[PDB]
Amino acid sequence: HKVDQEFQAAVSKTSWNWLLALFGGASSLIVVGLIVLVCSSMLINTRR
Amino acid sequence: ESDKTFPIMLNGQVNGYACVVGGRLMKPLHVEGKIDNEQLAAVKLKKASMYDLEYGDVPQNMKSDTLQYTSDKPPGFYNWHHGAVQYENGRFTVPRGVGGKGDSGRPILDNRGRVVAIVLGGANEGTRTALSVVTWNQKGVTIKDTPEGSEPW
Amino acid sequence: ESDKTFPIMLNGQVNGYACVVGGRLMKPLHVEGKIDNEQLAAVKLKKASMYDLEYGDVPQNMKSDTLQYTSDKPPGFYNWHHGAVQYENGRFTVPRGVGGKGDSGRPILDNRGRVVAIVLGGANEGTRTALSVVTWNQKGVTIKDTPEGSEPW
């Protein structure tokens, strides 16, 4: 072989795409959840 | 008259009270111990820690007996267990140092025979006692109020 | 009253009632039987399980003989065929056990005799039973009220 299997490139575009898709779902779910917890906190202070 | 109200028995101590409002039993969360009535105790209350309160549907045999909550809170004097309390500048105010620990969960009664709020505790600035209370905005939004340096009872 | 409301017979045993309002005949859908009239029973019925009721329209010979509808629903006591009933905070409440099975379809009447609700049934409990009556919004839009654990009568 003429070159090493560098991990950053051993992941195929399709495979890396699905990996980032799943981690994107999880990261978005946690970030959106945190944002929702923030916004919900504001709900009471906006009406008292 | 306020016999439709029930204190919590902790080690045989009335460390707090509870009221059945709108068919839901409400007691302060901070008030440790078991409620007096065994049928009410069967209710698995749902807590709302931001209010220091926990709520749950009273069983189907006494929801008719619930106290009616009151939206309107015009400035004036409101009935209580320890006589009556003034409401001023949006806060219930009481004679200096009367009432204290163990009174949490006592309902405040509309002169018409309705409940306007439930007390959590109070504070003193030096001139008068200011109460901490759960309230309802004119719109009907349920709220909690706590004067500066509020102490729960 | 019975001047404009009629009993239903289970082959000979009374088991329900039907009401005519604004000329529209109305009857709780869970009540089987036939009205004790040959003109009213002949009318076709449309039924909707979301309202637990079925309805028709009376012949023009009796267009003048129907309960007048109203949605003026201020909180207060209302008259009923088995003594007055109390309406408050969006709830219809009545002394315990009155009515029961076979009493559904009984209307509730204004001081002027205007109908305000129709009994589907209710829940039996505590100091007062709450009816699961079909009423309307202030906008005059029909609503079905079904307090938890209510039973058809």
From Swiss-Prot, chains B, C:
The active site is at H30, D52, S104. The modification Phosphoserine is found at S2. This is Capsid protein. Homodimer. Homomultimer. Interacts with host karyopherin KPNA4; this interaction allows the nuclear import of the viral capsid protein. Interacts with spike glycoprotein E2. Interacts with host IRAK1; the interaction leads to inhibition of IRAK1-dependent signaling. Part of a tetrameric complex composed of host CRM1, host importin alpha/beta dimer and the viral capsid; this complex blocks the receptor-mediated transport through the nuclear pore. Interacts with host phosphatase PPP1CA; this interaction dephosphorylates the capsid protein, which increases its ability to bind to the viral genome. Forms an icosahedral capsid with a T=4 symmetry composed of 240 copies of the capsid protein surrounded by a lipid membrane through which penetrate 80 spikes composed of trimers of E1-E2 heterodimers. The capsid protein binds to the viral RNA genome at a site adjacent to a ribosome binding site for viral genome translation following genome release. Possesses a protease activity that results in its autocatalytic cleavage from the nascent structural protein. The record marks Y78, N111 as: Involved in dimerization of the capsid protein. Phosphorylated on serine and threonine residues. It comes from the Viruses. It comes from Western equine encephalitis virus (WEEV). It is found in: Virion; Host cytoplasm; Host cell membrane; Host nucleus. Residues 46-51, 138-142 are annotated as: Interaction with spike glycoprotein E2. The chain holds residues 107 to 259 of 1236 of the full protein. The modification Phosphothreonine is found at T5. The very N-terminus plays a role in the particle assembly process. The N-terminus also contains a nuclear localization signal and a supraphysiological nuclear export signal (supraNES), which is an unusually strong NES that mediates host CRM1 binding in the absence of RanGTP and thus can bind CRM1, not only in the nucleus, but also in the cytoplasm. The C-terminus functions as a protease during translation to cleave itself from the translating structural polyprotein. Residues 4-153 form the Peptidase S3 domain.
